[PDB]
Every structure is written in structure tokens, then in C-alpha cells.
Symmetry: C4
């Protein structure tokens, strides 16, 4: 389990990419 | 652990930014 | 806790909005 | 519960779609 939460935390990137997209607009 | 879920909840922002992107289109 | 996972599941929407964005492009 | 984390892991796609969006810009 503490494992599955670690793999979920593997979301920061999603954020980063959203920011990048905004920059692209 | 209750900790790792707190850091995952640190997603609301992802939503917000998506909405912002839509506004940019 | 089972609670914090319920609030995390409150991501489907993120998907939906991404799809919508694509449609906007 | 290990179940709710499995359904949360059902985020990889979110990533993929973001990448696709970038490609669309």
C-alpha cells in the first residue's frame, strides 16, 4: 500500500506540464 | 501514510489550472 | 483515511476536462 | 481501501493526454 501512494506521487509532473501548456498559449 | 495522502491532496490546483487553460482557448 | 481517498477520487473530472481541451484545439 | 488506490491509479492517462495536448500546440 505505502507503495501505491508512492506510485501515485510519481502529480508534481502533471503540474509542471500544465504550466508548460499555459506558457505555450 | 495519512501524510502521503495529504501530500497528494496538496488535485484542486490541477483543476484550477485546467480551468484557466480553457479560459485561455 | 478512507475519507482522504474519497476526496482524491472527487481525477474523473480532470480527465473529462482534458478531453474537453483537446476538443477546443 | 487498496482498492481505492487501484482506482486512483486507473494518472498515467492524465499524463499521456497532457502530452498529446502539447503536441496539438
Amino acid at each position: 500500500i505505502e507503495d501505491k501512494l508512492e506510485e501515485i506521487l510519481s502529480x508534481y509532473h502533471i503540474e509542471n506540464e500544465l504550466a508548460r501548456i499555459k506558457k505555450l498559449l
